[PDB]
Amino acid sequence: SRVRQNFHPDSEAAINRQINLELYASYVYLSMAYYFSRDDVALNNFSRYFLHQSREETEHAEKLMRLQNQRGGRIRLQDIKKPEQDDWESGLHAMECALLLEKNVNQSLLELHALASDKGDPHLCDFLETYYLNEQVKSIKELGDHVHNLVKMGAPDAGLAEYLFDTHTLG
Amino acid sequence: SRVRQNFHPDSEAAINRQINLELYASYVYLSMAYYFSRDDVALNNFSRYFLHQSREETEHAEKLMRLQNQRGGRIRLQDIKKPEQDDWESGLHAMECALLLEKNVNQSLLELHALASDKGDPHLCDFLETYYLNEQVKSIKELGDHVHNLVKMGAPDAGLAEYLFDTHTLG
Amino acid sequence: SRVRQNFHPDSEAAINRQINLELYASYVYLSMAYYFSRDDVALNNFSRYFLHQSREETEHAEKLMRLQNQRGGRIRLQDIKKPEQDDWESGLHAMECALLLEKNVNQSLLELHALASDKGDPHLCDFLETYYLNEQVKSIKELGDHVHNLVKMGAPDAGLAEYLFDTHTLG
Amino acid sequence: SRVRQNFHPDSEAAINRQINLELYASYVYLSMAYYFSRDDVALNNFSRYFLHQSREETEHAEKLMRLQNQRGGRIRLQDIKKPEQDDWESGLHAMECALLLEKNVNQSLLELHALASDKGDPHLCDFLETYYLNEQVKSIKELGDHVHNLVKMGAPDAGLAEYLFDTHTLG
Amino acid sequence: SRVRQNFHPDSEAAINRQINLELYASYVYLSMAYYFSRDDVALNNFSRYFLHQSREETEHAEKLMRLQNQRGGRIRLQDIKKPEQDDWESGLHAMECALLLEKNVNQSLLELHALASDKGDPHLCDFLETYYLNEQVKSIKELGDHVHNLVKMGAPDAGLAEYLFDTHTLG
Amino acid sequence: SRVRQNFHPDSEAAINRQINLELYASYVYLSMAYYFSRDDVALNNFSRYFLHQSREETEHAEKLMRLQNQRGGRIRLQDIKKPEQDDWESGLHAMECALLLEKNVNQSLLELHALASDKGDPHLCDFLETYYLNEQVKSIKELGDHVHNLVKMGAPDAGLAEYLFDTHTLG
Ligand SMILES: [Mg+2]
Ligand SMILES: [Mg+2]
Ligand SMILES: [Mg+2]
Ligand SMILES: [Mg+2]
Ligand SMILES: [Mg+2]
Ligand SMILES: [Mg+2]
Ligand SMILES: [Mg+2]
Ligand SMILES: [Mg+2]
Ligand SMILES: [Mg+2]
Ligand SMILES: [Mg+2]
Ligand SMILES: [Mg+2]
Ligand SMILES: [Mg+2]
Ligand SMILES: [Mg+2]
Ligand SMILES: [Mg+2]
Ligand SMILES: [Mg+2]
Numbered sequence A, B, C, D, E, F: 001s002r003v004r005q006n007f008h009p010d011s012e013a014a015i016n017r018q019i020n021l022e023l024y025a026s027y028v029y030l031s032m033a034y035y036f037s038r039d040d041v042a043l044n045n046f047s048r049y050f051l052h053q054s055r056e057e058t059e060h061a062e063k064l065m066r067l068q069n070q071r072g073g074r075i076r077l078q079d080i081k082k083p084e085q086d087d088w089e090s091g092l093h094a095m096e097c098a099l100l101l102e103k104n105v106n107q108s109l110l111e112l113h114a115l116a117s118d119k120g121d122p123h124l125c126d127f128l129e130t131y132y133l134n135e136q137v138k139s140i141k142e143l144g145d146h147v148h149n150l151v152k153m154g155a156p157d158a159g160l161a162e163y164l165f166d167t168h169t170l171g
């Protein structure tokens, strides 16, 4: 590529793996969004919250695809795996799964950063630091806050918990 | 499901297959969008055109997921297969592939409609007719128009063809 | 902490020490602010300048406290030591002390960054780089500019120096 | 001091002690604010409520520092002691601690007023009456209201209590 | 310098070399701008494009000069070498030269970053990452896009190529 | 050149020399601008004044480059020599140097005009008279005014002189 410079093939490959992971995260959140709009779950603000998260993940994927093109790398897409469950059980369970998902994605981003550092790619490092790492920290913290409140409120067994959390925190 | 009424398990299953196909179409268009922003392709309006198509397909999938929930069906997601190519060759080739993709999706929607008709599900029939069938016809016609103009202009070999089409028609 | 990830206990501890240092810097500037509003000093723009610096330091402390919470660390507060003097002698002396204070705080932030780098915490590194390091450089440069002008003008002995600097530069 | 008039050295000293106490109160509230934004507490309106209280206490300190300067007294700062706890246990416990803190600060202000009265300093008396005494009464009453509601609601053990109080009363 | 801190003489020197390189890049683009406004070239949008690039390079130089002053380094200017050619041959050739120029400048910035990293200067690293590295990547990508389109269109020999590119892409 | 008319090769050459001189003047002023923003000089309005002069000189160069193209001449760039000093000593010294620089540039413009007159090029004469000669006279007069005031005020030794001149005249 006539634009390629200081861009290691390993970094290129890792960015393609990260693109897939971001699309996967988007899919997991899309699945959660629609679980909450089932007639037997019907927590509309949980639904909207996860739908919004899904859309943010798609943008995470797109920024990485754009990065690949900017650096002269070549996007290699792979199947986007379906989420682990179609039935997310409860608002609390979905939040705990989302928290695990974000920590796993964060671990992947940190490994990508370590690789970029090892390959002396400050541009890639800065890209990750600028658009991903703090976003992950904020997301993990937010999900943690949500999990804590849902647990304290008595979800999923306390009948008013998820309903009130949906209406107040996610409203 | 306490909301389920006149909703055949076969229709429920076919809607889940259609949801997957729509997500797949979205993925194909996302792939095309980013192929056109490669430094060695760089047709930005082809890129924007396909990105927009990708986003429309996601909405097609979401409406079907919403339909499933409204009718009391249960969404069962499957892996979203990667597109057939990562290198779409040219603006003309991508348009021809998009045309084939839309005809295939249309065939699937027509089969879904025939099933819905066979199962006496006027609501599903109307849903398909209202949000999908004419949309497909318009999309297929538009792609056909584009393919014709690109071919006539001499794409992909005539150096000015895709460039001019990108700037005038897709601009 | 269910949100904690890649956050070394040493980094957590260093952030708590930095929080204290920022609160201390805020206190030093608060002390300076009110020294300049004494009836026998009465340089109101020096007073306002330092009060503003004091408030900025409090925000520096708060961002670190927020960082601690985001990362899952636990804030451990310590006494905020009183400033070294209650009588800051002159506008020049206060500016020289502020310069020393900012260089000391900068050294602390650089040590924190080195620790974060050693612990492979790019998020913490980026946090420091984004909100602290350049802020320190700008502050040190500004104070240096002020010290130079006050010295050149003849402060503290030249009767018109601090008065004119207060009215023109800090006004 | 050429501005000093009818200002007893004992009053000057007591004002310096009060300045310290106000800074201490500010610190206690800052600590509480950030306890409520921990991922395992996550009551954001309790956090905002206490942060606001913290900022009000800083202004209480500043008004006393300004008073000292106006009267010709000399500000003598002392270490600001860290709060008694870093872990405030619960929204109810933090409110009860805040109530105790405000009653203690009020006792200090009343002793200051008695001293000012004994020294025949009507200006100081009026200053205390105007900016501090009623503020304390209003604060103590508000905290009392909050403590009562939290207790009645079943905090800290009733899972919905602090959550609902955070969203309704402190929202 | 009383503001100097953690600023290695080697970094200071490298920043002075980079300042010169940025001024040189500005000069190359100024030369290109005016080549395109020759009566026998007359591609006004190529002219405007390069003039704009020239002005951006001057700002790149100024930010580095400001950095030098902020850190306490001393700016040492050197002759700004004239560009390699006064006759840039064609719109395609000028774009290819600009691409080479930007890759060379990027290599220099990456070497500066490696030096700053070796000297443990996170502030300098962050400065480069924040204002230079991604800017270079975006510029190189843009030039690559332009080169690709001009080549595909048949520039410089196809009479309509540069003319159409000037009017559509650079317009 | 098919546009060339009544344009002597000597005039073409002299315009190229003048272009270089204008770029040189711009560089001298850029150097001065950043000397005044050193932490040990810190006269920000002197800095802004010279930066503005630098930018005006660049426009002087550009107008001559445009003139060359309009007349059918060919721009031949040469190295832009670095300024005689990096340390401009004082606000007064920089102003005296600027005055000498402008008188030297004016002498060059007057020689260019004499050449243009000798070659019977009224267009070139008028161009010089319209955009350069009076501009030089105004600039020389302004610098003279500044030098006089700085000298009278006691610069560079009188500590308040440059500071007050910076704040009042150049503010
Ligand atoms: Mg993501
Ligand atoms: Mg599988
Ligand atoms: Mg780094
Ligand atoms: Mg960075
Ligand atoms: Mg579709
Ligand atoms: Mg396969
Ligand atoms: Mg119908
Ligand atoms: Mg600070
Ligand atoms: Mg002590
Ligand atoms: Mg960073
Ligand atoms: Mg108080
Ligand atoms: Mg103690
Ligand atoms: Mg009374
Ligand atoms: Mg009264
Ligand atoms: Mg540059």
Ligand SMILES: [Mg+2]
Pocket (backbone or CB within 6 Å): none
């Ligand atoms: Mg040479």
Ligand SMILES: [Mg+2]
Pocket (backbone or CB within 6 Å): A126, A129, C126, C129, C130, E125, E126, E127, E129, E130
């Ligand atoms: Mg950075």
Ligand SMILES: [Mg+2]
Pocket (backbone or CB within 6 Å): F022, F025, F056, F057, F060, F105
């Ligand atoms: Mg000039």
Ligand SMILES: [Mg+2]
Pocket (backbone or CB within 6 Å): none
């Ligand atoms: Mg020389």
Ligand SMILES: [Mg+2]
Pocket (backbone or CB within 6 Å): F125, F126, F127, F129, F130
């Ligand atoms: Mg005339």
Ligand SMILES: [Mg+2]
Pocket (backbone or CB within 6 Å): none
């Ligand atoms: Mg004045």
